[PDB]
Design a protein around this nucleic acid. Structure first.
Ligand SMILES: Nc1nc2c(ncn2[C@@H]2O[C@H](COP(=O)(O)OP(=O)(O)O)[C@@H](O)[C@H]2O)c(=O)[nH]1
Ligand SMILES: [Mg+2]
Lengths: 77, 136, 386, 277
RNA sequence: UGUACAACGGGGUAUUGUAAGCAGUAGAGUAGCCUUGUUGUUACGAUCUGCUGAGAUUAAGCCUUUGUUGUCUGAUUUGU
RNA sequence: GCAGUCAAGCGUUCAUAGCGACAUUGCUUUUUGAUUCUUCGAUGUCGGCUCUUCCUAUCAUACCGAAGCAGAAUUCGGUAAGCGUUGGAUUGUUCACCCACUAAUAGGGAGUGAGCUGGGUUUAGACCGUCGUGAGACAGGUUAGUUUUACCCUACUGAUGAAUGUUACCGCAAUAGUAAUUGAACUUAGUACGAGAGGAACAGUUCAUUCGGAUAAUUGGUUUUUGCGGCUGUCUGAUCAGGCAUUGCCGCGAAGCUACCAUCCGCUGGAUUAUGGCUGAACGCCUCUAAGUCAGAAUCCAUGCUAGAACGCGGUGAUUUC
RNA sequence: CUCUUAAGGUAGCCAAAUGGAUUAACGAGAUUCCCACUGUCCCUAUCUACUAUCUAGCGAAACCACAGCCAAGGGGGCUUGGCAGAAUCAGCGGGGAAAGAAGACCCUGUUGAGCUUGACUCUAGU
RNA sequence: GUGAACAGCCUCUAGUUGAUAGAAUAAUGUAGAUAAGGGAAGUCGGCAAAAUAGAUCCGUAACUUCGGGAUAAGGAUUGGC
RNA sequence: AGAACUGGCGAUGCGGGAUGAACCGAACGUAGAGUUAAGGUGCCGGAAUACACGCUCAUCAGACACCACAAAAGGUGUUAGUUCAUCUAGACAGCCGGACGGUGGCCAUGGAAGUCGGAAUCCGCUAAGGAGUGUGUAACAACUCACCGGCCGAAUGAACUA
RNA sequence: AUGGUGAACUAUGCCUGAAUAGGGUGAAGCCAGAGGAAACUCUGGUGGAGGCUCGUAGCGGUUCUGACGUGCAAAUCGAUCGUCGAAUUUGGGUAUAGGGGCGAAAGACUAAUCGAACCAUCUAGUAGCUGGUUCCUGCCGAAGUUUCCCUCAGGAUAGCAG
């Protein structure tokens, strides 16, 4: 009966989202974030056991001069 | 599911297409049933309506008591020779595929069933479970 | 003349063209919606599909017919050693779409990534990032400039990770590099996190955890040129039909005087990129932990490695992700595991998974034993023994 | 209860009835062929009343075919009782050993004499499928002119047969009228039904035991002492070796054979004519 | 020029179903032989039993490898 | 349809000279659901197998409006083509009709005339019927009866690819495609509603149908693993170990391939239609509409998913030493 | 001118055993049905050989106005649009003055020749 | 040699090893097989395949021109020693 | 459909109608210049996004032929008209008030009082008020309009045509 | 039409040669046994008949959504099938020759030719008809209709251009 795109069932889903489901998502995420912090701490703890530049400037200037010299510019003529 | 069926029925491998003779497990006097139709089947183009354990069919009594033949009564498949899966994983099959005569509301015409009855059919049909001396 | 009996289309028109995927590693075309209030997290991961095995699960699904009953499930084991961050990419939001603004790499890159940048690694001088490490020497002025640029302008930050493929049983030494988007935290927090991580690894349990639904994005198994009867499921024509019976019979009408794009034709099957979503994580294993494959109902003290290893894949010496059901892609294949793009509202996404048993019997035959110890104790002593 | 088989509707087909109405529209004299075994069963009254209303000038005649399968007194009683309504004529159709051929020739020749103003006279034959209209035409014309087959429904169209320069015979597909007063059990025992397609022919056998006499049925098949039809079939099948693979009798097939013997005049049966008057 | 790769080998892991050879009284019985006797005995004899879940196969698109032996080399082209 | 009638109007000059909408009346098988259970010349060969798309004149599913619509069900109507629309029986075939299943078994277009096929156009054989003096031809009926791309172009399905310094990696997204579907089960409940018989639904849950996309843990299938074992016949003197039997045959058989014969997975935001409204003129009442505006369908457009412009683009790495 | 067709209650009368053709046997004859059996199908899958495929050698043919992307119009070329990027490989069988019959069923000339007949003119024979 | 056999299969004498080859093992084909459960529901039509099959023994119907039908049908067996 | 005539095409290009047997224009050698026809002048496209008076908004406008069809009508779209009617003895729209008396007229019946019905349908008092226009009641009650009147203040209504 | 040439293919007659495993059935005759007086009837054998049967070689050509379809082949290949002791199959010799022969009659066959073989000539047979019909320019330039042969056809006249 009621389709996937059904407004009624989607609205029941949306009411349900904000309850137990988003709670469980956010709590799960907090736990995984703490595990990541543990992981980085362990790794740093084993660690203690021991323009942009001239390249990009010439690159861009050449590219723009080639586009102006072959008449192939999106932005200028 | 059907009329008189208790709750949902999960997928089991279809064993009994239309035109399949199946034994009559009950004591209603029929000796075999001939599936002419299957309840609940979808409309796929060349697909024969097929029946499995726990499914209600429409069957004619082909051999047996003359008071029962030439008539089309509903039947409920209680055994099956096609191996199907039980969720506590085991694929199982019976030695014959058989059914019982039921009125469309689920009641058994017979007063007993002989031989084993699958639990997927006993569970789904209370009047089958209540008439089956051997389950699984 | 109208179609006499209405039948639905064979196949899906949204999975077209059924061509070979442009790369073996399937792209992630969408990442979960960024929520800056949450802390910084990785939205995907990279692992290798090791194989499949059997699980008994103590199902707690209220309202079900299998409620409070053990149910046997097939699962897929994805070998997931930790991936290590090597770079950042900042994306600006432009009226023609997202745009990579800049990319900052770690100071030291392993051989595994550097191999990814050559077709002929053995012949090379291995000069991969030699003029780029020097940008860290001059107190990191260029590195800091591009990171400040990401902070100033980027509206999407993606980290660049890669797999420690040497930890897998694979023969391939060329690691797999990818962009993983960082969700949570502001742009500056994303960049600072990533800078702090430029040579540290990220374990799989720092991205996913048990009882989470994840997406599997992988290029499927390839089958070569395959005909209509099985590329699309078209019915076989009657026996000994002239010109053959494994082909579609009529192709077109008197008009449009062409074969339509919708008519099923033969061609490449498989090796297509697919995104399969909502795969429940049944176990996030730990590499160092022996008894990976043991549970609280099964005390055998065994790892998830079947006897004889997996078939066409070695042992599981690493962290692994065991997901319910089957996954696109075959064994040995890089898969991308993604966080779910939406807060799923099914009750399956909420269930805690309670395994009773993992099938570590051999996949190289009709394996009947879980451990070599069990096989020995069932056989008895042989003639190799006295 | 099961569906009505398509084989008990045969003869009610619209093409057959169109063919009959052509035969009637084109005939001056209409012969209604009757089976002497059960004439009243094989009498199509609806066509008779249609002709009495719509075509009073066309002449119905009864011809009591298969007249050699009843006793002489039964044939005589039936002609006595049907002549009170319609001029009937006893007849046994056989190209070599007929009876009533001369009488029918004389009657048709008189019918032509009455219509001397109309210089061709067409005589159409009417009845159930298996009564013998083609066999009567072949008898009169004195060779295998129309197609003759015991399985009913052979001829599908009418055909003109030129008996004489003045007289034409028209064979017709046999009809069965759809009046519900006749059972669908009865539409089988009149030779109308191809018994091959009868789905459960084991049920009509007590009907045969009703129609036939035990004294004759013990003799047509050399078997005796059946308590019931359902075991009459099995004792006959064991006698004839019609046992399927595994020791069980070919019960449906033997029933089909018994019904075929009944309708094709291998078993002696008739319904007794009405009482003396 | 190496936790390299390869060809073999070892170990698992899987498939079959108990190898070749020898022995045995185990054996339907039939011949012969005398100690003419109850495992009489010498020979044949399908088969049976013991060595023997033995023997074979096992990546060719299985896993692993403290072993052995060898290889690491040519050709072509590409510049803002 | 024919024959009337009336007359809004028309002609007009005369409204009786005539036309003439709507409305209506006579004719059609007997007023008490019986029959009228009832058939009557298609000079027609088209029709099924596979497969695609479109139409809306909507059968179902979605949402509405009107009904003595209590409930349940139904009827009539509106928007609506997103998505489905069956298995058989039957006869020249097809519809019909029949049986059943189904949510429903809607109606059509382009159809598939030498993609494949059945009857018919079916040519020389033959038989019967009718006619003709005849040769013969027909009111017929029955039977048997070779037909052959593409290797060309284009379309379509997949696969490479030259050069825009070279080379490598990581991405963007114009455009184009798009997908999910239906049923019933627990609970809401034996509640609302009801004399009673009966008896919903939303919210919360669980499965399944059809489709689709994958996958091979398991189960099943398959076996040139000719992997292992056996069997027949013969040949290598016997044992061994083997050959041959157009893969010899039989049993088991890993791996691989594979099956609703196995398993997993398939969503959520905007804007609307009918309709229901708000404020409010037109028009000193009123009015959902004119200005403005709220909600609202399986719709649309996006999200998500597939491809990636081979002449769309970005970021980044290395750029040849004698 | 007259007038004609109404015998009994489950097998009769009978004709120098039968009263039949409802004929055995036979049949690559036409048709229906049943059992058995099966991939005919549900609903497809897998395997083997040879192809196809790639290479070395050898090397045709049909066909051919020129070409070869679509839509609407015009009672492929012209009109108006959609567009359009080298060179290509395997499939495919929608379309192609693209070939393969344009055959078959039709129409017409004063158009042969086979056959018939109290059509005409003749004639062997008799 | 097997076997009833000048059948099929294997071999001795004699003859031949000639038919363009090599490498892969996609779809579709040609030829040949196997397939769970059901068993004609497929089809215009059980087409094609399957099933049967040698020999011994038991047994064998209607009908009949008395000759047949008839290998009717339906059963029980088969090795080695 | 028949007759009679006259034109066009055949044998014939060219300009225009996007296109073209039947339409509009047009006296065909090779050119140059000017001017035009029919058709046009936003851009494709040579030529005014000219001037001017109105009308029209179409949830698939029209650009188009017209004593052509679907075509006779339907519309609380808009515009211009025609005829008739009402109006400082107060118009249209609003509120407010009266809306009476015989009388609950007769018949009917469980009831029927203007309003289930059948027939009458008159009189009085009036500024006006039906033996009642509808909602209503079991009947009444009440409300309502049609009809008057009070307040307001100046135009309005109806049918038709384009 | 005239005159010739073919029975090496094939049709049929004749003369002279040749070829055809293994099985099933079990006819007459005969033998023994028992019945009956006898004709003879029953049982057990023997025997080995048949335009009999299964089935090789052989001869044929049924069926297949068979293979092939510029093929190996202008009729093959594969499997399946009919028959297989004779009205059989077959070599050579010999006879029949075209308005003929020969035919278990299908117009079947008569050298890939048959609704009348093949070859040459008369013969360049006959056309209502189809296709084609070869250089340039200048100038003039139609008709597509009347009237009669009953009419169609086929034609003769007027009309237009000269
Ligand atoms: N015994 C008998 N049988 C007859 C007679 N007439 C016809 N039949 C049978 O009827 C069968 C065929 O019937 P048919 O003539 O085709 O019936 P129709 O279609 O009415 O002419 C034939 O086999 C005859 O044996 C008769 O007079 N006596
Ligand atoms: Mg007949």
């Amino acid at each position: 009966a009621k389709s996937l795109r059904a407004s009624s069932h989607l609205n029941a889903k949306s009411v349900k989202r904000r309850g137990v489901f988003q709670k469980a998502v956010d709590a799960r995420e907090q736990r995984i974030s703490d595990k990541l912090k543990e992981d980085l701490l362990k790794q740093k703890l084993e660690d203690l056991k021991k323009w942009r530049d001239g390249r990009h400037h010439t690159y861009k200037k050449a590219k723009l001069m080639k586009q102006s010299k072959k008449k192939t510019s999106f932005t200028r003529f | 599911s059907g009329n008189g069926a208790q709750g949902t029925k999960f997928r089991i491998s279809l064993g009994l297409p239309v035109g399949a003779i199946m034994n009559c497990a009950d004591n209603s006097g029929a000796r075999n049933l001939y599936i002419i139709a299957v309840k609940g089947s979808g409309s796929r183009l060349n697909r024969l309506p097929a029946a499995s354990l726990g499914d209600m069919v429409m069957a004619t009594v082909k051999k047996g008591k003359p008071e029962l033949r030439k008539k089309v009564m509903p039947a409920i498949v209680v055994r099956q020779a096609k191996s199907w899966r039980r969720r506590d994983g085991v694929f199982l099959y019976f030695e014959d595929n058989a059914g019982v005569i039921a009125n469309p509301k689920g009641e058994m015409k017979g007063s007993a069933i002989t031989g084993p009855v699958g639990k997927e059919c006993a569970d789904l049909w209370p009047r089958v479970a209540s008439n089956s001396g051997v389950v699984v | 003349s109208h179609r006499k009996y209405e039948a639905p289309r064979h196949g899906h028109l949204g999975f077209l063209p059924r061509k070979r995927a442009a790369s073996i590693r399937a792209r992630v075309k969408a990442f979960p919606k960024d929520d800056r209030s949450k802390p910084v997290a990785l939205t995907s991961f990279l692992g290798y599909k090791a194989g499949m095995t059997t699980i008994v699960r103590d199902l707690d699904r209220p309202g079900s017919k299998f409620h409070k009953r053990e149910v046997v499930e097939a699962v897929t084991v994805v070998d997931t050693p930790p991936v290590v961050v090597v770079g950042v990419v900042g994306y600006v939001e432009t009226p023609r779409g997202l745009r990579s603004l800049t990319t900052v790499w770690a100071e030291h890159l392993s051989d595994e990534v550097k191999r990814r940048f050559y077709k002929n690694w053995y012949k090379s001088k291995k000069k991969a990032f030699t003029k780029y490490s020097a940008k860290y020497a001059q107190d990191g002025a260029g590195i800091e400039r591009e990171l400040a640029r990401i902070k100033k302008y980027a509206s999407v930050v993606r980290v660049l990770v890669h797999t420690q493929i040497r930890k897998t049983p694979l023969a391939q030494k060329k690691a797999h590099l990818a962009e993983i988007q960082l969700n949570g935290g502001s742009i500056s927090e994303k960049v600072d996190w990533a800078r702090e991580h430029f040579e540290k690894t990220v374990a799989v349990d720092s991205v996913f955890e048990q009882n989470e639904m994840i997406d599997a994005i992988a290029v499927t198994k390839g089958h070569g040129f395959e005909g209509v009867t099985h590329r699309w499921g078209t019915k076989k024509l009657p026996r000994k039909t002239h010109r053959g019976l494994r082909k579609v019979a009529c192709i077109g009408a008197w008009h449009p005087a062409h074969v339509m794009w919708s008519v099923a034709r033969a061609g490449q099957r498989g090796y297509h990129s697919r995104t399969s979503i909502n795969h429940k994580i049944y176990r996030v294993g730990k590499g160092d932990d022996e008894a990976n494959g043991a549970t609280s109902f099964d005390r055998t003290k065994k790892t998830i490695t079947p006897m004889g290893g997996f078939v066409h894949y070695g042992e599981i010496k690493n962290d692994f992700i065991m997901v319910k059901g089957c996954i696109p892609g075959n064994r040995k294949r890089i898969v991308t595991l993604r966080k779910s793009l939406y807060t799923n509202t099914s009750r399956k996404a909420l269930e805690e998974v309670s395994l009773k048993w993992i099938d570590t019997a051999s996949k190289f035959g009709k394996g009947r034993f879980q451990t070599p110890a069990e096989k020995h104790a069932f056989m008895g002593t042989l003639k190799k023994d006295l | 209860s099961a569906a009505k088989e398509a084989i008990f509707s045969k003869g009610q087909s619209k093409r057959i009835w169109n063919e009959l109405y052509k035969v009637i529209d084109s005939s001056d004299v209409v012969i209604h062929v009757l089976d002497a075994r059960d004439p009243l069963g094989t009498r199509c009254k609806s066509v008779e009343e249609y002709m009495k209303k719509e075509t009073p000038h066309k002449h119905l005649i009864y011809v009591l075919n298969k007249c050699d399968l009843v006793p002489t007194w039964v044939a005589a009683a039936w002609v006595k009782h049907l002549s009170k309504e319609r001029p009937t004529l006893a007849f046994h159709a056989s190209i070599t050993n007929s009876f009533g051929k001369g009488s029918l020739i004389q009657l048709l020749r008189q019918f032509s004499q009455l219509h001397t103003d109309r210089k061709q006279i067409s005589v159409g034959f009417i009845g159930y499928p298996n009564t013998g209209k083609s066999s009567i035409i072949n008898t009169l014309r004195k060779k295998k002119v129309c197609q003759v087959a015991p399985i009913p429904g052979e001829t599908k169209v009418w055909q003109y047969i030129t008996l004489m320069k003045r007289i034409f015979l028209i064979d017709c597909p046999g009809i069965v009228p759809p009046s519900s007063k006749d059972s669908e059990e009865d539409i089988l025992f009149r030779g109308v039904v191809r018994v091959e397609h009868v789905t459960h022919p084991e049920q009509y056998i007590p009907g045969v035991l009703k129609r036939c006499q035990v004294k004759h049925l013990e003799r047509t098949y050399e078997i005796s002492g059946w308590k019931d039809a359902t075991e009459f079939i099995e004792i006959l099948a064991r006698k004839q070796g019609r046992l399927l693979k595994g020791g069980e009798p070919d019960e449906s097939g033997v029933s089909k054979q018994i019904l075929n013997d009944f309708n094709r005049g291998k078993i002696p049966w008739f319904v007794l004519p009405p009482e003396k008057e």
